[PDB]
């Protein structure tokens, strides 16, 4: 419910609680401590009630997140279908699009071992 799409973790650090948004990591979390100067790592609740708000803004309009970024990564792949490419046909199948090895493993693309007679 909080910022910016859904509520980041209170009682959690103001360097850690960052990555949790659909769009951030400990890599991008350096905008906090270094591009608004935020606390070393003292907690989210711990933060200053006006420092709390100054962080709300500087990452919404700076990057893309949540429902847009979910769709951004998503709607992008629809293109790959509408042309009929080797990356959009193997996604049309739901198989290892980034071209690897599909004999052993390739499970994460495939779901649990279906098993057959």
């Amino acid at each position: 419910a909080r910022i910016a799409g859904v509520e980041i973790p209170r009682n959690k650090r103001v360097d850690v609680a960052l990555t949790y948004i659909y769009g951030i990591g400990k890599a991008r979390a350096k905008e906090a401590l270094e591009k608004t100067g935020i606390n070393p790592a003292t907690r989210v609740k711990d933060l200053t009630e006006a420092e709390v708000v100054r962080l709300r803004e500087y990452v919404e309009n700076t990057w893309k997140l949540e429902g847009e970024l979910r769709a951004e990564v998503a709607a992008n792949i629809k293109r790959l279908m509408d042309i009929g490419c080797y990356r959009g046909l193997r996604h049309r199948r739901g198989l290892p699009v980034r071209g690897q090895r599909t004999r052993t493993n390739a499970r994460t693309r495939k779901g649990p071992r279906k098993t057959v007679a």
Binding site: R2, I3, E60, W63, K64, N76
Partner: protein, 69 residues
């Protein structure tokens, strides 16, 4: 009004937006926000956010026209 069971909502300051304490008598004494009627894509403005014109797709990657007709 049925006497009692309904929350006595006295006029409470909805401290939201960027300069609007959207006053109207809510049963919650005070409110906040981080995304409001103020700053919003469909509420006003083009809202490019930081998403330009579809990332870069496709001829906006430049380094094009190696060929000179």
């Amino acid at each position: 009004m049925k006497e009692g069971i309904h929350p006595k909502l006295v006029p409470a300051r909805i401290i939201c937006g960027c300069g609007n304490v959207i006053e109207t008598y809510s049963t919650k004494p005070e409110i906040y926000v981080e995304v409001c009627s103020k700053c919003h894509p469909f509420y006003t403005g083009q809202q490019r956010f930081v998403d330009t014109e579809g990332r870069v797709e496709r001829f906006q990657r430049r380094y094009g026209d190696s060929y000179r007709k």
